[PDB]
């Protein structure tokens, strides 16, 4: 019987100088104003930003302010520094507490291809009895990329995992790889291994493949 | 008011986390302290908190599992999180909650809400024992331009491993992914770089990985097949 607290957007994408405004939902209503709201950098502690809804606590700049009441709040920031890229939750008291899942604001640019590589597994690999297939998606924004693994055309479900980096400091982009594993014994039953990657900055999806056994 | 916090690290399943955080400029009966945790990539979790007459309140999914307790002569307070599993994988964070205050009808804790917080403490649950990775190179294919090349560094425990390209002399157009942790308990990740596809066949590229908790140190020369 938690409060549930629901976010939008997930992310937003802004450019320093330009506002951020953060909503915070609740499936009960908050006491009160009894509602908080927290930033987190990487690799650090979430920071108290916002208490009783608009309050701020020393030292959070005036660029910062809370509104809201009941089941519905809000957080913004009126114009993003560069140190404000970080990821916003909020947080009510007024029942067990509970948070909501976060809202990362990343940096905008402009659309930007991914570059695609396909890996075969190396003999040394397919030697010990495993078959790692890696797909690469270079310096790509946005973030949002599918990569859809086919084999002789059949759509693979299950058996490969994703790695993203972090937005790059220089060039705002995000790379990206997909690893498909096998045993040996079933990637030896095919010849046609594809990564498939659909982006907002391609025209059409890009496939790259190879044939099993072959250069 | 400054908090320091510490404990295990890694665990095993069904054994129990023990964590113990020390409050410093302050005392512990001004206010309500507690834990939270946050695994990895994922949000923040409200476990439970403590105040100096020992009385508690708990996350309810997890009041079963929790024991928290108070040294009001050290100034600390501690989680007991008892039979953890994979799933408890986080970082910990102790901070202080609400203040207790005294009105002239009233009396209780207030506006809980969390300030200061604790450095956090990454506590790992796992089955698996200390092993080195396997590196196994991602060969470049065969106008053009640009080509990319990496080493896959799979099956290794505990994190982390660090990856540099010819023994830190290549850093531009790198990229060293975050490990993901596969079924089998073990981690995995890659290391890439984009390199000018004309000097493949006089230039040199050899992935180093080390892997501090098993004394491992692996160097990979990565060559077109």
């Known amino acids: 019987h938690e409060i549930v607290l629901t976010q939008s957007p997930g992310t937003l994408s802004l450019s320093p100088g330009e506002r951020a405004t953060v909503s915070c939902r609740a499936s009960?209503?908050?006491?009160?104003?009894?509602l908080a709201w927290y930033q987190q950098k990487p690799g650090q502690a979430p920071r108290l930003l916002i208490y009783?809804?608009?309050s701020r606590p020393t030292g959070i700049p005036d660029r910062f302010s809370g509104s809201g009441s009941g089941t519905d709040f809000t957080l913004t920031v009126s114009r993003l520094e560069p140190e404000d890229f970080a990821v916003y939750y909020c947080?009510?008291?007024?029942?067990?507490?509970?948070f909501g899942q976060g809202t990362k604001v990343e940096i905008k640019r402009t659309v930007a291809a991914p570059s695609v590589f396909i890996f075969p597994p190396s003999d040394e690999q397919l030697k010990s009895g495993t078959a790692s297939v890696v797909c690469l998606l270079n310096n790509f924004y946005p973030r949002e990329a599918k990569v859809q693994w086919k084999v002789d055309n059949a759509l693979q479900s299950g058996n490969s995992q994703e790695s993203v980096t972090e937005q790059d400091s220089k060039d705002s982009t995000y790379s990206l790889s997909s690893t498909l594993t096998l045993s040996k014994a079933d990637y030896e039953k095919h010849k046609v291994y594809a990564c498939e990657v659909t982006h907002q900055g391609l025209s059409s999806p890009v496939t790259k493949s190879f044939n099993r056994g072959e250069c | 008011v400054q908090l320091q916090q510490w404990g295990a690290g890694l665990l095993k399943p069904s054994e129990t986390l023990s964590l113990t955080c020390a409050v410093y400029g302050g005392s512990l009966s001004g206010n309500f302290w507690s834990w939270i945790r946050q695994p990895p990539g994922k949000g923040l979790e409200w476990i439970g908190e403590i105040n100096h007459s020992g009385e508690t309140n708990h996350n309810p999914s997890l009041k079963r599992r929790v024991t928290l307790s108070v040294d009001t002569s050290k100034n600390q307070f501690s989680l007991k999180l008892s039979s953890v599993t994979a799933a408890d994988t986080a970082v910990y964070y102790c901070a202080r909650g609400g203040p207790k205050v005294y009105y002239e009808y009233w009396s209780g804790y207030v506006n809980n809400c969390f300030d200061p917080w604790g450095q956090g403490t990454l506590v790992t649950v796992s089955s698996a024992s200390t092993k080195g990775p396997s590196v196994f190179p991602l060969a470049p294919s065969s106008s053009g331009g640009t080509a990319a090349l990496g080493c896959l560094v799979k099956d290794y425990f505990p994190e982390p491993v660090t990856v540099s390209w010819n023994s830190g002399a290549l850093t531009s157009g790198v990229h060293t992914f975050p490990a993901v942790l596969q079924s089998s308990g073990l981690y995995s990740l890659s290391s890439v770089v984009t390199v000018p596809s004309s000097s493949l066949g006089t230039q040199t590229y050899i992935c180093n990985v080390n892997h501090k908790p098993s004394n491992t140190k692996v160097d990979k020369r990565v060559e077109p097949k």
């Open positions: 009783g809804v608009s």
């Open positions: 009960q209503s908050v006491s009160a104003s009894n």
């Open positions: 947080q009510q008291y007024g029942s067990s507490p509970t």
